[PDB]
């Protein structure tokens, strides 16, 4: 309601918006960092899809990212297609030992994972 009746501040109101302005950059980076943590944690419940029912290796990343979505993530917390690409692209980076994907002519192709202890490497987060 009409709560802001008497905030009779001095000329510090200019300094008031410095706090609004000068600190907003760090919070935006933190929100960016949270999404990275948001993505870097979802991959834990993603590689179980790969480990469970795919052992042949004709799959390109376009098909798999279209199956990261419309999948177990199609739940109380859906995920985006471009995020799914970021999810699948992060797997090689976080696990270089078992995944080595290279550009073929256009796009990426995904091969049969060698696989290990599926989630012990999450300590890198």
């Amino acid at each position: 309601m009409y709560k802001e009746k008497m905030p009779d501040s001095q000329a510090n109101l200019m300094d008031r918006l410095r706090e609004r302005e000068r600190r907003s950059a760090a919070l935006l980076s933190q929100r960016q960092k949270r999404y990275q943590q948001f993505l870097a944690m979802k991959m834990t419940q993603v590689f179980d899809i790969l480990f469970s029912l795919t052992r042949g290796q004709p799959y390109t990343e376009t098909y798999l990212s279209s199956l990261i979505v419309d999948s177990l993530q199609d739940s109380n917390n859906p995920i985006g297609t471009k995020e799914a690409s970021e999810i699948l692209a992060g797997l090689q980076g976080i696990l270089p030992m078992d995944i080595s994907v290279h550009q073929v002519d256009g796009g990426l192709k995904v091969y049969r994972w060698n696989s290990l202890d599926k989630n012990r490497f999450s300590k890198l987060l």
Binding site: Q57, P58, K109, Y111
Partner: protein, 408 residues
């Protein structure tokens, strides 16, 4: 380097070399044998390049597995209807448009038999489409005759799919695909066929071996000469329609329709209305346009309907998914269509154009069917004025029998 299981051989190299063409004529009646030899050759070539050349060491999966080879640009034959009973089982090359796809149909490759009295299991594989039932259990002790039983869901199967193609010889032919070639061809795909013409005791079909999903430098010199000359636009108008005199802007108009804009994802399907007097050669144009342009469809608004333009869609018992009978408008997908008598088109049919000229799609939701299509095309429209002649004493928007939503 590739983790693939096959190679799409650049078969145009066969006509680019002398001895290969001689092989082609020899291979015209025996394509299977060489491909089977090439499979072992590919594995041997892999093994020789990996470990014999000592350039690699990952060989285990390749050595055990099986490969294939697919020539894709072999010289075309004399067309479909020109083939002969002896041309059956010969390698051919054809082209066409895919219309419909059947669902995944598995076929037997390995049969799993278990002895019903002693649980012994045998692995039986089919050769040349023959199932051989074991007569007795192979164990030394258990030898009961006819004891072997078949378990349906312990066998091994391979994908078999029937894809329907509208073939234009160098009529529609029902193609066939197997293994990884299934579901690689989907409705509306532009297709060139490299396979085997087949008719067996007799229906005409092609066992597709490979499928293709799709001039001189002197011509480039010829193009640049017209491209460089200053009378380019003047020459084009002077040369496009010899029968039609002058009409510089009309020459520029329809020509820009054929050039079209750029397509981004926003299409360049330019559409034109000829509001001319009902005696100026405009049918003489659009009849001529239908021929000169890359092959489209000639339609009349008076003689067309919403079903006639769009489609008739129904279910199929065998395929268990929707099938389409393409109308006039859909058949012009990606090309140019001419709609004469546009002023005489039925109101229900005219309602279709609204979504066509805004999204190039058509959405249908009727009894048992709910789906959307795509009909990206260019429209050339000619319309006589209201009455026997144009009446400039009335506003132009009143001389045209089209609503503002459609006229805009």
């Amino acid at each position: 380097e590739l983790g693939t299981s096959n190679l799409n051989l650049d078969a145009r190299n066969l006509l680019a070399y002398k001895q290969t063409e001689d092989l082609y004529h020899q291979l015209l009646n025996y394509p299977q044998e060489v491909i089977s030899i090439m499979d072992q050759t590919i594995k041997d070539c892999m093994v020789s390049l990996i470990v014999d050349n000592n350039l690699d060491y990952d060989l285990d999966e390749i050595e055990t597995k099986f490969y294939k080879v697919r020539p894709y640009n072999v010289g075309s034959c004399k067309g479909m209807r020109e083939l002969n009973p002896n041309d059956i089982d010969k390698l051919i090359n054809l082209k066409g448009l895919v219309l419909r796809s059947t669902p995944v149909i598995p076929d037997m490759k390995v049969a799993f038999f278990k002895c019903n009295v002693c649980d012994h299991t045998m692995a039986v594989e089919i050769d040349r489409g023959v199932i051989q039932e074991p007569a007795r259990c192979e164990r030394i002790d258990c030898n009961e005759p006819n004891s072997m039983s078949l378990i349906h869901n312990r066998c091994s199967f391979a994908d078999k799919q029937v894809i329907k193609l509208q073939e234009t010889p160098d009529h529609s032919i029902s193609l066939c695909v197997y293994d990884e070639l299934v579901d690689s061809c989907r409705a509306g795909d532009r297709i060139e066929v490299t396979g085997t013409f087949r008719s067996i005791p007799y229906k005409t079909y092609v066992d597709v071996v490979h499928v293709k999903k799709v001039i001189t430098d002197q011509d480039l010199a010829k193009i640049r000469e017209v491209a460089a000359r200053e009378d380019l636009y003047s020459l084009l108008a002077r040369s496009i329609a010899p029968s039609i005199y002058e009409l510089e802007d009309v020459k520029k108009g329809i020509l820009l329709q054929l050039f079209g804009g750029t397509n981004k994802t926003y299409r360049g399907d330019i559409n034109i209305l000829l509001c001319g007097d009902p005696s100026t050669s405009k049918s003489q144009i659009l009849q001529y346009v239908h021929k000169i342009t890359p092959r489209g469809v000639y339609t009349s608004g008076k003689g067309s309907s919403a079903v006639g333009l769009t489609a008739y869609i129904t279910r199929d018992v065998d395929t268990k998914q929707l099938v389409l009978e393409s109308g006039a408008l859909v058949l012009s997908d990606g090309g140019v269509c001419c709609i004469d008598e546009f002023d005489k088109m039925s109101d229900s049919t005219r309602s279709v154009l609204h979504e066509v000229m805004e999204q190039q799609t058509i959405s249908i939701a009727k009894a048992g069917i709910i789906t959307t299509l795509n009909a990206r095309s260019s429209i050339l429209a000619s319309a006589n004025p209201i009455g026997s002649r144009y009446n400039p004493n009335l506003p132009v928007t009143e001389n045209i029998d089209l609503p503002p939503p459609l006229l805009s």
